[PDB]
Amino acid sequence: TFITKTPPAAVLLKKAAGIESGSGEPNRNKVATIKRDKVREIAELKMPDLNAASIEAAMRMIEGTARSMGIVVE
RNA sequence: GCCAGGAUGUAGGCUUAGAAGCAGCCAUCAUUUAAAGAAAGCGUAAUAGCUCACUGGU
Ligand SMILES: [K+]
Ligand SMILES: [Mg+2]
Ligand SMILES: [Mg+2]
Ligand SMILES: [Mg+2]
Ligand SMILES: [Mg+2]
Ligand SMILES: [Mg+2]
Ligand SMILES: [Mg+2]
Ligand SMILES: [Mg+2]
Ligand SMILES: [Mg+2]
Ligand SMILES: [Mg+2]
Ligand SMILES: [Mg+2]
Ligand SMILES: [Os+3]
Ligand SMILES: [Os+3]
């Protein structure tokens, strides 16, 4: 009955990586490198607000947002 | 030609008083798809709104 909207993937990724802001040049200057176990946790929490058909698809999106801000997943 | 869609993470990150597809900078991934650009124009203070690409019907 009441919408609990979760934080933007970006702010979730910022928190996970432990930083205050993304790269001004995503491709050239990476400012953080997290592991998938985390990208996975984000895709699980952000799941209600996602239109994915599975977690791996959810992570695809989450990782896509990590690419736009300069964060690296391993 | 006309009708209908043109979506979701997301107001991408940065910067900026604001900067939400559309001041400027760096990128331009992914999801759900029949299709739909991190958007080709108009538009807003920033939003909104309208149109285009793209798809279906006729
Ligand atoms: K803008
Ligand atoms: Mg003609
Ligand atoms: Mg979008
Ligand atoms: Mg912003
Ligand atoms: Mg904001
Ligand atoms: Mg400055
Ligand atoms: Mg809008
Ligand atoms: Mg922008
Ligand atoms: Mg639009
Ligand atoms: Mg503008
Ligand atoms: Mg039309
Ligand atoms: Os319309
Ligand atoms: Os596509």
Side-chain angles (χ1 to χ4, degrees), chain A residues 19 21-33 63 66-73:
Chain A
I19 58 172
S21 48
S23 176
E25 304 60 54
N27 49 314
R28 309 169 189 170
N29 308 160
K30 274 57 172 50
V31 46
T33 71
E63 302 176 312
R67 178 173 170 182
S68 66
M69 60 201 281
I71 297 183
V72 188
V73 195

Side-chain angles (χ1 to χ4, degrees), chain A residues 3 5-6 14 16 29 38 42 47-48 52 57-58 65 68 72 74:
Chain A
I3 56 88
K5 202 160 188 177
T6 56
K14 276 182 168 204
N29 308 160
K38 293 304 292 67
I42 294 183
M47 196 59 257
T65 299
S68 66
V72 188
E74 296 188 309

Side-chain angles (χ1 to χ4, degrees), chain A residues 2-74:
Chain A
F2 265 122
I3 56 88
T4 302
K5 202 160 188 177
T6 56
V11 78
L12 284 171
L13 279 162
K14 276 182 168 204
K15 175 175 183 175
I19 58 172
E20 274 277 300
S21 48
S23 176
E25 304 60 54
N27 49 314
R28 309 169 189 170
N29 308 160
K30 274 57 172 50
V31 46
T33 71
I34 52 177
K35 296 193 169 183
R36 292 205 161 186
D37 282 309
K38 293 304 292 67
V39 167
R40 202 185 193 69
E41 302 195 307
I42 294 183
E44 298 190 0
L45 171 67
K46 197 68 183 171
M47 196 59 257
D49 304 67
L50 296 182
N51 67 337
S54 68
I55 284 189
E56 30 283 313
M59 302 193 297
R60 242 68 74 58
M61 276 164 89
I62 296 301
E63 302 176 312
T65 299
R67 178 173 170 182
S68 66
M69 60 201 281
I71 297 183
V72 188
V73 195
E74 296 188 309

